[PDB]
Amino acid sequence: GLTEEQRMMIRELMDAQMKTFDTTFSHFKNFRLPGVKWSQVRKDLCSLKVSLQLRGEDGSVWNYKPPADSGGKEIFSLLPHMADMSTYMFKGIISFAKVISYFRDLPIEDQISLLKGAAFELCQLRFNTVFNAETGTWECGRLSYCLEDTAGGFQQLLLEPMLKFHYMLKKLQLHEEEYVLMQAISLFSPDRPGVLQHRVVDQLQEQFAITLKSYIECNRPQPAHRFLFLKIMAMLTELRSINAQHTQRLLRIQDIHPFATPLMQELFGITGS
């Protein structure tokens, strides 16, 4: 059974989620779109291929198909747009954290250290709820990002850590409550660089984890859900690892071809000097 403290915990989390997660992306607009040595490393984009579809509120449909690597620039045509999508998502994530009392009560410095450390992770957790594993497309309201099929299909795509992460998590068929608790556990990570009240954060995280484990125990008796709590924690550990690698990937691209917005710069620690 769920204690009163646990029920209020989930409620506050769900309330924060509904108030700050624009699931239809209706407020995402004015975004940029692709025009009408260290480079070899920059080839990180390779493991990425997504077409973009924009459905007009009038019935019209714009569809974009990316180019192929053949020289230079070309592979950076989608960065501005993605930087804008990232920024929109980050704003929603920052808002999520701020409305939560457990977060508001932490020192302003720790709130920042926690947000810079978990923003990417929280964004992926939200993106997974709009991911369609049948069609391999993230349905963001009137925008859709579909994976461009190639060489070997599904098995070939799961080789990309982030993609395998999205399919695996989606396969667990989690409830809204379990997703928001995953966001909390990720947000309240006592082991982020720059955290002072690591003692309080650690205890808060354990409470969220305990609440999740109990939620699962109380509402998922099916044999298919055995070890679900542990599977979820392993996924969060994996997401943290994916976070570190993608940050390094982003910084390398940023160094050669700047695109990070001011908010992204803030979150990634870029000073502007």
Ligand X SMILES: CC(C)=CCC[C@]1(C)[C@H](CC=C(C)C)C[C@]2(CC=C(C)C)C(=O)C(CC=C(C)C)=C(O)[C@@]1(C(=O)C(C)C)C2=O
Tokens of 132: 């369609």
Least separation in angstroms between CB 179 and ligand X: 15
Least separation in angstroms between CB 36 and ligand X: 18
Residue 14 to residue 176: CA distance in whole angstroms: 8
| Cβ-proximal residues to 4 (8 Å cutoff; 6+ apart), any chain | none
Return the number of the residue (185 or 242) whose C-beta is nearest ligand X. 242
Residue 266 to residue 248: CA distance in whole angstroms: 15
246 is in an annotated binding site: yes
Least separation in angstroms between CB 222 and ligand X: 29
249 is in an annotated binding site: no
124 is in an annotated binding site: yes
Tokens of 39: 């480079």
Least separation in angstroms between CB 213 and ligand X: 27
125 is in an annotated binding site: yes
Tokens of 264: 């992204």
Return the number of the residue (197 or 261) whose C-beta is nearest ligand X. 261
Q: What share of the chain is helix, strand, coil (3-state, %, to 5)?
A: 60, 10, 30
| Residue that has been written with the tokens 């579909």 in this structure | 146
Least separation in angstroms between CB 205 and ligand X: 21
Is the CB of residue 88 less than 8 Å from the CB of residue 25? Answer: yes
126 is in an annotated binding site: yes
Residues that bind ligand X in the complex, under the rule CB under 6 A: 45, 48, 50, 78-79, 82, 85-86, 89, 120, 123-124, 127, 138, 145, 162, 246, 249-250, 253
What is the distance between the terminal CA atoms of the chain, rounded to a whole angstrom?
Answer: 54
Return the number of the residue (9 or 140) whose C-beta is nearest ligand X. 140
Find, among 168, 176, 173, the residue nearest to 126 by Cα: 176
Return the number of the residue (41 or 230) whose C-beta is nearest ligand X. 41
Return the number of the residue (9 or 253) whose C-beta is nearest ligand X. 253
Q: Residues comprising the binding site for hyperforin? A: 86, 124-127, 246
